């Protein structure tokens, strides 16, 4: 069914745990800052070189699913890896663990990827939930990815 990413988004921190991004960078998070009822401003982070890169973005709310009721995506604006579209279509029951479509275009080459995205510091002894990460694993199998974590605990 479809769940509310503007909810799933209303989280201190989201970390990129698993990513079929070619070569993404370490560290890759979402902290948020504030939401209107239709577009929420947040910060979007990563490790370049050492460097701790921070774009300001704005995700504009809309709709994959048919019924449109529920938010289940983000359009973006300038986003400096070139990811324009975001659908979040699947989080855990206790709605700490969520997988994302992403849709990129740079430079005449456009591309998609899928994440598994946590909401909030990942832990020593935490797994999540089994059906989110054995589903992004299904993915991975069906159209022979690569997968990678982003994820360190010496992330800042």
Request: charged share 25%; hydrophobic share 30%.
């Amino acid at each position: 069914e479809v769940y509310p990413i503007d909810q799933f988004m209303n989280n201190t921190e989201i970390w990129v745990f698993n990513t079929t991004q070619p070569d993404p960078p370490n560290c890759k998070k979402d902290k948020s800052k504030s939401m209107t009822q239709t577009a929420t401003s947040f910060v979007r982070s990563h490790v370049k070189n050492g460097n701790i890169i921070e774009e300001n973005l704005v995700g504009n709310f809309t709709y994959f699913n048919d019924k449109e009721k529920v938010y289940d995506g983000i359009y973006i604006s300038g986003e400096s890896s070139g990811v324009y579209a975001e659908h979040l279509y699947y989080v855990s029951e206790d709605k700490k663990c969520g997988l994302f479509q992403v849709f990129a275009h740079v430079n005449d080459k456009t591309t998609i990827w899928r994440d598994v995205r946590v909401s909030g510091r990942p832990e020593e002894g935490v797994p999540l939930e089994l059906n989110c990460t054995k589903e992004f694993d299904e993915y991975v199998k069906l159209v022979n990815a690569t997968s990678k974590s982003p994820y360190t605990s010496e992330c800042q």
